[PDB]
């Protein structure tokens, strides 16, 4: 697809293999929502932003939105390659 | 505003008074997302659907989506009056 699209599809497949529900998120009347909402068993909720490669940072409005979430304790992760998806699961799940 | 709009605004204000971040949610290319994502301190995540009155049930696609979330342990609540917002906070927070 697109590079970003391929990483997103892999992530979706890995999370669904763990029993997770994956949704593509957007906000009504606001930008900056994380690309994926991931609902994993036992009430684990992850918000995952997907980028095209490991050197691509999220844009400024995205970064401020991730920090608003994390200040309150929410799980927000950024991945930009298949390896990063694999490390996220290994280390955080 | 609309009845549903007034309850939604009250809910937003009550959650923001607890330190919460409130967002109006939508999905890309899918319907049925809960009306509100609420991120409360200490990583508490609530999805809240708001209706115009206490007798209005969510539509069928919404109900199936709430159950997909709750099967995995997520917090999904439906409120349709100011009193229900108040009871939700009293009982669940």
Residue numbers in the entry:
A (entry chain A), B (entry chain A): 2 to 94
What do the authors report?
However, we were able to solve the first VRR-Nuc domain structures using single-domain proteins derived from three bacteria and bacteriophage as surrogates: Psychrobacter (psNUC); Streptococcus equi bacteriophage P9 (stNUC); and Salmonella enteritidis typing phage 3 (saNUC).
saNUC was solved by molecular replacement using the stNUC structure as a search model, revealing a dimeric arrangement of two molecules in the AU essentially identical to that seen in the stNUC crystals. By contrast to the other proteins, saNUC only formed nonspecific, higher-order complexes. stNUC and saNUC exhibited weaker nuclease activity against the Jbm5 HJ substrate, detectable only at protein concentrations above 1 μM and with increased reaction times. Under these conditions, stNUC showed robust activity, whereas cleavage by saNUC was much reduced. This suggests that our saNUC preparations have a low active fraction potentially also explaining the lack of structure selectivity seen in the gel mobility shift experiments. Whether the levels of activity observed for stNUC and saNUC are representative of those in vivo is unclear, but it would appear unlikely given their close structural homology to psNUC.
